[PDB]
């Protein structure tokens, strides 16, 4: 089976920051740069 | 900018590119429910 | 100097002032000296419990 | 929170007596098919279904709403256990 | 399989509050519709407001009138709450005259009647007088949209006139909500709820119609390139 | 597809108990009214995370 | 008067993939009021065409490799998701493109057999590398729709061994709008709105813009007949 990312899957970076996907937003809902580029992941600053 | 309202976030945000790994722990392999099923030999309690 | 909290938060909508700016607002008969953010918080609690007093 | 939970907790001296009253009343409603309810037709709980609004099937919801009305009597040593069931059967045959 | 047209329901109480529900909507269209309408309701609906007041024997807005409990600031704050509706589209600006003798309690109904002008709230409290108190006023009511501070327009009729913040918008407050709805196996649908508070001069439904019209009129601007 | 409509009726009014181990105090078990959702993960209210 | 007149529209286009649409002068705050609703509609609700099913001869599933072909089926299908097909017929709903190649060659999107009223917008797209003795005979099904439909949802298989492909029908690639400070007469708070639209070429930015305006315009007619 080819598994795509879904709500409840666990993501992490190399610096010990880990969490579960809790929301998958449509592209038009994500914050974007003034040039029109949406971001891919939103991380809480309270974890640092 | 906010994708829903179109207005800017009131403060500048730390936007960047980060390397994120998808870990082996997936909710697909962990969701489980039961109503009735196998029972133990001696105690007759549900199996685990 | 705002006549009521709705007028103060209407000015916030138009960008006249920020929620953190200290202004004068007339709330419950008292001429308070607070920010629209604190008047907004008071309205938040009043509506959840449905008792302004 | 359950609707009127504050009022329900104030009708009994012990919070665990309210659970006994509601749980026992719910069984009376289930056993007689909700025909013994003290709720008026305009007060019956309803559930939104695709076809339309029908009576709520949850008897614990019915018991809690009935208790708030004040048309139920509860206590200890009200009537004999055997006699209560016999009388209820006659009034609401099932 | 395009989604069916949503059902628009209105739950209006009086002439100052109302709730409007539009459902079901395609995913994300509650925000697509609620945000543009909310911005128009709070900034573009035409209205009237007091933009200037003249009080005899009053020099500056931070003074105090002898014989009246309220100071100049408090009287001005009361005027900001006045709701006036022009009954003649040609009429653009009017002046309201108020003369009172103590120790009466001045109300909005004490204003001298003016043709084609209706005071929506005549029971509004303006000032309180005592024996020997005098209140001569000349309030100038204009037509406009949005919120305009006194320092911005700076409207003065005669010398010693006091500019007042012009609350032109008849809509007091707008709050829209989006909830998840489902139509069978479609679960990402949207339900839009729009709550509008008004001063009573225009009903919330009237305001909503004007906001929808204003957005529609602007969409016709994408018509003739160059 | 009618099974899911019937399920929405079965759970109406009912509650379920959510349990997280270790159950240090009694607030480690709490009753909630389920909202049937698409997916495979349980959604937990933010305000009950400290108790759990 | 305070009633601002009709703005002047301005269109600047670079081929079929970029377009700038300027609308000025506007009232204060209408740049965001008009720009954002259009941007949300453009990014989600604009119909397009996508590959929904691919059949490769002698291949049973997508977890296999084709003898003589450098890429596996998973990689080939990923390349096919980048194919841009423009239907010249408004009534056309589906088309099957046939590719028949033999090694040694690099099969591009220009190797598909021609179809009537169908044009490939990126003929240089790389599909597969064929080594000597390798053959690639596949049928690609291109549908028309809106949004993002995963292959698990539509499950389209023209035949037994066809492989459903996740469909991203949206033709718009990126949308951005800029609000500048323009002044008209004695009013200096006015707005100038600039929509920047990037498309894949199947739908020109102007066509996508017009559809977005119509979608918003039709949604505004749902506030007409209250049910109360
Ligand atoms: Mg595409």
How far is E84 from D27, CA to CA, in rounded Å?
62
Strand partners, E96: E139
Write out residues 13-42 of C within 8 Å (CB-CB) of E: 13-14, 16, 26, 31
Distance from CA of D80 to the nearest CA of F (A): 32
Q: Does B31 touch chain F (CB under 8 A)?
A: yes
With touching defined as 3 or more inter-chain CB pairs under 8 Å, the answer for chains E and C is yes
Last residue of a domain, one of G169, G192, G208: G169
CATH number reported for the structural domain that contains residue E104 in this entry: 2.170.120.12
- The verdict on E19 and E125 lying in the same domain is no
Output the DSSP codes for chain G.
Answer: --S--PPEEEEEEETTTEEEEEEEEE-TTHHHHHHHHHHHHHHHS--EEEEEEEEETT--SSS-B-TTBSSBHHHHHHHHTT--EEES-TT--EEEEEEEEESSEEEEGGGSPPBTTEEES-TT-EEEEE-TT-EEEEEEEEEEESSEE-HHHH---SSTT-EE--EE---EEEEEEEEEE--BTTB---EEEEEEEEE-SSS-HHHHHHHHHHHHHHHGGGGSS---
Q: How far is the CA of G85 from the centre of ligand 1 (A)?
A: 8
Collapsing DSSP to helix, strand or coil, C2 comes out as strand
Angle at the Cα of E51 (from E49 to E54), degrees rounded to 5?
A: 125
Say how many C-beta atoms besides its own lie within 10 A of residue E34's C-beta: 23
Q: Does F5 touch chain D (CB under 8 A)?
A: yes
From the list G44, G62, G174, the residue facing A36 with the nearest CB is G174
- Domain residue ranges of chain D, discontinuous segments joined by +: 1-94
How far is E53 from E136, CA to CA, in rounded Å?
10
Written as six digits, the tokens of E22 are 């539009």
E35: closest chain B residue by CA: B5
DSSP class of residue D27 equals H
Compute and round to an integer the Cα radius of gyration of chain A: 13
What is the span of the domain harbouring residue G193? 4-47+170-223
- Tell how strand F29-32 and strand G126-130 pair up: unpaired
Report yes or no on G228 lying in a domain.
Answer: no
Q: From residue E30, give the alpha-carbon distance in Å to each of C48, E189, E194, F38, G221.
A: 24, 9, 10, 20, 15
How far is E38 from F4, CA to CA, in rounded Å?
37
Asked whether G188 and G17 are in contact (CB, 8 A), the reply is no
Asked whether G17 and G200 are in contact (CB, 8 A), the reply is yes
- The verdict on G134 and G178 lying in the same domain is no
Strand partners, G180: G192
- The verdict on E21 and E64 lying in the same domain is no
How far is G123 from G113, CA to CA, in rounded Å?
12
CB contacts < 8 Å between B and F, how many? 7
How far is G68 from F5, CA to CA, in rounded Å?
51
Q: Could you tell me which residues come within 8 angstroms of residue G71 by beta carbon, excluding any fewer than 6 positions away? A: G79, G128, G129
- The verdict on E125 and E202 lying in the same domain is no
Q: Among candidates E151, E164, E138, E160, which has minimal Cα distance to E74?
A: E164
Q: What is the dihedral of CA C18, C21, C27, C29, to 10 degrees?
A: -140
Q: Among candidates E205, E213, E207, E208, which has minimal Cα distance to E11?
A: E205
- The verdict on E91 and E193 lying in the same domain is no
Written as six digits, the tokens of G33 are 């009021």
- The verdict on E106 and E205 lying in the same domain is no
How far is E132 from E102, CA to CA, in rounded Å?
6
DSSP class of residue B9 equals P
CATH number reported for the structural domain that contains residue E39 in this entry: 3.30.1360.10
- The verdict on E31 and E141 lying in the same domain is no
Written as six digits, the tokens of B18 are 């980060």
How far is A27 from G115, CA to CA, in rounded Å?
33
Residue numbers in F near D53 (CB within 8 A): none
Looking at chain A, which runs of residues are DSSP E strands?
Answer: 10-13, 18-20
How far is E201 from E141, CA to CA, in rounded Å?
14
Please state how this structure was obtained.
Answer: cryo-EM
- The verdict on G41 and G60 lying in the same domain is no
Of the CA atoms within 13 Å of residue A6, those in its CB half-sphere come to 13
Q: What is the dihedral of CA E184, G171, G198, E186, to 10 degrees?
A: 10
Please determine, looking at this structure, whether the domain spanning D1-94 carries the CATH number 3.40.50.970. no
- The verdict on E13 and E93 lying in the same domain is no
- The verdict on G119 and G202 lying in the same domain is no
Give φ, ψ of E61 to 5 degrees: -65, -20
Say how many C-beta atoms besides its own lie within 10 A of residue E46's C-beta: 16
Per the structure, the count of domains in chain G is 2
Q: Among candidates G97, G166, G174, G107, which has minimal Cα distance to G136?
A: G107
- The verdict on E148 and E215 lying in the same domain is no
Residue numbers in B near E35 (CB within 8 A): 4-6
- The verdict on G117 and G57 lying in the same domain is yes
Asked whether E194 and E6 are in contact (CB, 8 A), the reply is no
């Amino acid at each position: 089976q080819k598994r795509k990312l879904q709500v409840g899957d666990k993501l992490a970076n190399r610096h010990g920051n880990k969490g579960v996907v809790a929301k998958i937003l449509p592209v038009e809902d994500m914050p974007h740069l003034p040039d029109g580029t949406p971001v891919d992941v939103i991380l809480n600053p309270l974890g640092v | 900018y906010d994708g829903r309202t179109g207005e800017p976030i009131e403060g500048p945000i730390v936007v960047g590119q980060m390397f994120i790994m998808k870990l082996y722990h997936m909710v697909e392999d962990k969701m489980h429910a039961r109503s009735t099923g196998p029972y133990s030999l001696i105690t007759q309690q549900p199996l685990g | 100097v705002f006549a009521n909290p709705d007028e103060a938060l209407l000015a916030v909508a138009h960008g006249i002032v920020d929620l953190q700016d200290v202004v004068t607002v007339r709330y419950m008969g008292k001429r308070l000296e607070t920010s629209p953010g604190r008047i907004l918080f008071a309205r938040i609690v009043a509506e959840a419990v449905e008792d302004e007093k | 929170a359950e609707p009127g939970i504050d009022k329900l907790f104030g009708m009994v001296d012990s919070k665990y007596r309210l659970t006994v009253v509601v749980a026992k009343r719910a069984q009376q409603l289930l056993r007689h098919g909700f025909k013994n309810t003290v709720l008026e037709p305009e007060e019956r709980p309803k559930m939104q279904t695709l076809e339309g609004l029908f009576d709520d099937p949850n008897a614990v919801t019915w018991a809690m709403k009935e208790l708030l009305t004040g048309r139920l009597v509860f206590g200890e040593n009200l009537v004999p256990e055997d006699r209560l069931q016999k009388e209820m059967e006659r009034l609401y045959p099932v | 399989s395009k989604l069916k047209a949503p059902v628009f329901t209105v739950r209006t109480q009086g002439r100052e509050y109302g709730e409007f529900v539009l459902e079901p909507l395609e995913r994300g269209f509650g925000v697509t519709l609620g945000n543009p309408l909310r911005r128009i309701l709070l900034s573009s609906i035409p209205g009237t407001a007091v933009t200037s007041v003249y009080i005899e024997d009053v020099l500056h807005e931070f003074s105090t009138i002898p014989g009246v409990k309220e100071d100049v600031v408090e009287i001005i704050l009361n005027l900001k709450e006045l709701v006036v509706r022009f009954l003649n589209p040609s009429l653009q600006t009017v002046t309201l005259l108020l003369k009172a003798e103590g120790p009466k309690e001045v109300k909005a109904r004490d204003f001298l009647p003016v043709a084609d002008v209706e005071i929506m709230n005549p029971d509004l409290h303006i000032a309180t007088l005592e024996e020997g108190g005098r209140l001569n006023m000349e309030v100038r009511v204009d037509r406009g949209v949005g919120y305009v501070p006194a320092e911005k327009h700076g409207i003065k009729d005669r010398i010693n006139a006091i500019p007042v913040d012009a609350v032109f918008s008849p809509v007091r407050r707008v709050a829209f909500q989006v909830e998840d709805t489902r139509l069978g196996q479609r679960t990402d649908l949207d339900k839009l709820t729009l709550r509008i508070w008004t001063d009573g001069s225009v009903t919330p439904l009237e305001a909503l119609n004007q906001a929808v019209e204003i957005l529609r009129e602007h969409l016709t601007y994408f018509s003739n390139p160059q | 597809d009618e099974v899911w409509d019937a399920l929405e009726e079965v759970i109406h009014g009912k509650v379920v108990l959510l349990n997280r181990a270790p159950t240090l105090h009694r607030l480690g078990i709490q009753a909630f009214q389920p909202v049937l959702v698409e997916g495979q993960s349980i959604q937990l209210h933010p305000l009950v995370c400290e108790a759990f």
